[PDB]
Amino acid sequence: QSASQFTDPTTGFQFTGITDPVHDVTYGFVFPPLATSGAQSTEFIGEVVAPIASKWIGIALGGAHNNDLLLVAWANGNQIVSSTRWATGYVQPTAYTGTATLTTLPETTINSTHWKWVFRCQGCTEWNNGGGIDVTSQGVLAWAFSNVAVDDPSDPQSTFSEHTDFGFFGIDYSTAHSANYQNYLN
Template sequence: MRWGFGLACVATLLGIASEASADVFRDPDTGFTFSQYNAPITTGSVYITFRIAIPSTAIAGQSYDAVLQVVAPNTAGWVGVAWGGSMTNNPLLIGWVNGGSAVASVRRSASHTAPQPYTGATLQVLSKGTKTNGTHWQFTAKCTGCTLFPTSGTNSKNLNPSGGNRFAFAYSRTKPSQPASSTSPINVHDLFNYWEHDFAAAKNSDFPELVARNLNFSSSAH
């Protein structure tokens, strides 16, 4: 995912710059405290920012909701996040913008083929944390079913709420062929990479209240 916009630009234009380079980001729009990772996408200071928030009551071995926030340059047609750190056998959250709104869906693939809509997880886009401007777009979404999921056979994976979890991301410069539809086919990505995301720093003691508050401004996507 190689783009030409820096976090300073994102911060200034989206009102998020003061903490854009920190490992923990407190979002003034949604109220969530996120742990964040800035994924470098060029040889310079150009990034896609990925942020995670989870409830402080999350227990290892059990499913819990998670909120994902992505900030990307407008040159990104779509951005995807693999919750299990690979393209196959885990939930893939795919997001893009259509006009001033975010479109997102959860998909899954059993092989290195185009991922299809995944019914094992439910996604809600939080519109208060979703915005665009002349250079960047941002979306925020709550996922139910992204932290505990089947992998292959009878095996399953649970994301550790108190440590690091291997994630992967992918992006394409080309928008989906039907950008108004959350089930639109997507083209092959232009770049992908991996990182270890810190969930211990993502905990929010008031997570249920923040979700309820933000859902008053949200629209659903699957």
């Protein structure tokens, strides 16, 4: 599948991403301006817009279960619980030990039918294994989905069972940058 540009109609934030038609989950990403000199920023802003039937959602930042930064989130009442994770060998991802700070942004909204997780991911383009994403080129993202609740929803590091579905999408990171990024942070 292929990402495209869309505007969130309530916040006005502009993202690049997809809606999975099976679970009707929207995934969106937006990056700060490309640097004219020096290194690129290592942060981005994302969102997951998920029906309440979605018990946990994962984003795989290099498109794979293994050897890449994973973001996991679920709703627990009127709060989003989230974490950064990492796996090798196809087992339960555990807490990531690198430098990546996930912050839930105030646009985050939980209503009677959906949870809309809007987040800032600092240090999320470069990982402590030396890998990461190249924000000037084309890559693959993946998502993972479960309709079964995690073992303990109040614990950000809760265990849980394997996803019931996963999927992939191509993204042109070069076109996912926004002049309005700094405004999204305010």
